[PDB]
Design an enzyme around this catalytic site. Structure first.
Site, PDB file in Angstrom:
ATOM      1  CG  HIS A 200      -8.102  26.827  -8.613  1.00  0.00           C
ATOM      2  ND1 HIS A 200      -9.115  26.754  -7.683  1.00  0.00           N
ATOM      3  CD2 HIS A 200      -6.983  27.157  -7.925  1.00  0.00           C
ATOM      4  CE1 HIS A 200      -8.632  27.026  -6.485  1.00  0.00           C
ATOM      5  NE2 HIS A 200      -7.339  27.274  -6.603  1.00  0.00           N
TER       6      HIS A 200
ATOM      7  CE  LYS B 294      -8.876  25.133  -1.475  1.00  0.00           C
ATOM      8  NZ  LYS B 294      -8.341  25.296  -2.850  1.00  0.00           N
ATOM      9  CG  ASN B 295     -15.408  25.410   4.351  1.00  0.00           C
ATOM     10  OD1 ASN B 295     -15.817  26.571   4.358  1.00  0.00           O
ATOM     11  ND2 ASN B 295     -16.141  24.390   4.778  1.00  0.00           N
ATOM     12  CD  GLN B 296     -15.769  28.950   0.258  1.00  0.00           C
ATOM     13  OE1 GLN B 296     -16.594  29.283  -0.603  1.00  0.00           O
ATOM     14  NE2 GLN B 296     -15.725  29.509   1.466  1.00  0.00           N
ATOM     15  CG  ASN B 297     -11.046  24.124  -5.109  1.00  0.00           C
ATOM     16  OD1 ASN B 297     -10.013  24.784  -4.973  1.00  0.00           O
ATOM     17  ND2 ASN B 297     -11.306  23.401  -6.198  1.00  0.00           N
ATOM     18  CB  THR B 298     -13.487  28.392  -7.641  1.00  0.00           C
ATOM     19  OG1 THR B 298     -14.279  29.034  -6.635  1.00  0.00           O
ATOM     20  CG2 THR B 298     -14.041  28.738  -9.021  1.00  0.00           C
TER      21      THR B 298
ATOM     22  CG  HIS C  95      -3.657  32.897  -5.148  1.00  0.00           C
ATOM     23  ND1 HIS C  95      -4.228  32.023  -4.248  1.00  0.00           N
ATOM     24  CD2 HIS C  95      -4.210  34.108  -4.900  1.00  0.00           C
ATOM     25  CE1 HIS C  95      -5.088  32.677  -3.489  1.00  0.00           C
ATOM     26  NE2 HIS C  95      -5.096  33.944  -3.863  1.00  0.00           N
TER      27      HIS C  95
HETATM   28  N1  LIG Z   1      -0.717  37.282  -4.886  1.00  0.00           N
HETATM   29  C1  LIG Z   1      -0.157  36.073  -4.691  1.00  0.00           C
HETATM   30  N2  LIG Z   1       1.003  35.761  -5.504  1.00  0.00           N
HETATM   31  C2  LIG Z   1       1.714  34.538  -5.431  1.00  0.00           C
HETATM   32  N3  LIG Z   1       1.271  33.562  -4.513  1.00  0.00           N
HETATM   33  C3  LIG Z   1       0.132  33.763  -3.656  1.00  0.00           C
HETATM   34  C4  LIG Z   1      -0.599  35.019  -3.730  1.00  0.00           C
HETATM   35  N4  LIG Z   1      -1.614  35.018  -2.864  1.00  0.00           N
HETATM   36  C5  LIG Z   1      -1.586  33.834  -2.233  1.00  0.00           C
HETATM   37  N5  LIG Z   1      -0.538  33.056  -2.695  1.00  0.00           N
HETATM   38  C6  LIG Z   1      -0.062  31.618  -2.301  1.00  0.00           C
HETATM   39  O1  LIG Z   1      -0.746  30.597  -3.069  1.00  0.00           O
HETATM   40  C7  LIG Z   1      -1.448  29.611  -2.283  1.00  0.00           C
HETATM   41  C8  LIG Z   1      -2.620  28.999  -3.041  1.00  0.00           C
HETATM   42  O2  LIG Z   1      -3.957  29.262  -2.376  1.00  0.00           O
HETATM   43  P1  LIG Z   1      -5.343  28.645  -3.064  1.00  0.00           P
HETATM   44  O3  LIG Z   1      -5.267  27.206  -3.243  1.00  0.00           O
HETATM   45  O4  LIG Z   1      -5.399  29.294  -4.403  1.00  0.00           O
HETATM   46  O5  LIG Z   1      -6.495  29.078  -2.221  1.00  0.00           O
HETATM   47  P2  LIG Z   1      -7.968  28.810  -2.365  1.00  0.00           P
HETATM   48  O6  LIG Z   1      -8.191  27.999  -3.500  1.00  0.00           O
HETATM   49  O7  LIG Z   1      -8.355  28.047  -0.957  1.00  0.00           O
HETATM   50  O8  LIG Z   1      -8.591  30.126  -2.545  1.00  0.00           O
HETATM   51  C9  LIG Z   1      -1.735  30.369  -0.987  1.00  0.00           C
HETATM   52  O9  LIG Z   1      -2.099  29.484   0.053  1.00  0.00           O
HETATM   53  C10 LIG Z   1      -0.411  31.215  -0.851  1.00  0.00           C
HETATM   54  O10 LIG Z   1       0.649  30.486  -0.173  1.00  0.00           O
END
Ligand SMILES: Nc1ncnc2c1ncn2[C@@H]1O[C@H](COP(=O)(O)OP(=O)(O)O)[C@@H](O)[C@H]1O
EC number: 4.6.1.18
Length: 135
Positions: free
Chosen positions: A16, A39-43, A130
């Site tokens: 990100h 990955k289907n989508q990513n920001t 995350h």
């Molecule tokens: N509130 C949180 N606190 C700490 N770790 C988290 C939390 N929520 C999700 N995660 C972990 O972090 C990972 C990162 O996901 P991510 O790459 O950010 O998703 P996406 O980009 O597809 O939205 C998740 O797959 C999960 O295992």
């Protein structure tokens, strides 16, 4: 999911923050080659890692995605960002996946935790792990 060589903070940065190219199709290859799938989508947030670390310092709030987590933080202000959407799945040869790109200026909510004791640099005791949501 994340490759083993990455701490959650480094993976967050890889997915990100460090958009290696302003074009999603190219930028997404890094993420897809590490995850072994497209990955289907990513920001990609067009801001600095330091800026996100500071956002971790803002008041704690419930994570929009998981109502049981309280380690999320609101950015306070909007930032430029590019959202990547998969348009060409390419079953085999993930390097052939193509993406569309959507530019926008939104607020973001990130979840942060204490750094990986063994692998993250002591410089940042608290790091984003995350991306919970963009608004
Ligand atoms: N509130 C949180 N606190 C700490 N770790 C988290 C939390 N929520 C999700 N995660 C972990 O972090 C990972 C990162 O996901 P991510 O790459 O950010 O998703 P996406 O980009 O597809 O939205 C998740 O797959 C999960 O295992």
């Amino acid at each position: 999911m994340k490759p083993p060589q990455f701490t959650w903070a480094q993976w967050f940065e890889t997915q990100h923050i460090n958009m290696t190219s302003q074009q999603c199709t190219n930028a997404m290859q890094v993420i897809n080659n590490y995850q072994r799938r497209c990955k289907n989508q990513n920001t990609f947030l067009l801001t600095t890692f330091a800026n996100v670390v500071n956002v971790c310092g803002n008041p704690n709030m419930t994570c929009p995605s998981n109502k049981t987590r309280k380690n999320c933080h609101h950015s306070g202000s909007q930032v430029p960002l590019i959202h990547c959407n998969l348009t060409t799945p390419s079953p085999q040869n993930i390097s052939n996946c193509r993406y569309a790109q959507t530019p926008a200026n939104m607020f973001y909510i990130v979840a942060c935790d204490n750094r990986d004791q063994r692998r993250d640099p002591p410089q940042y005791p608290v790091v984003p792990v995350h991306l919970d949501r963009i608004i």
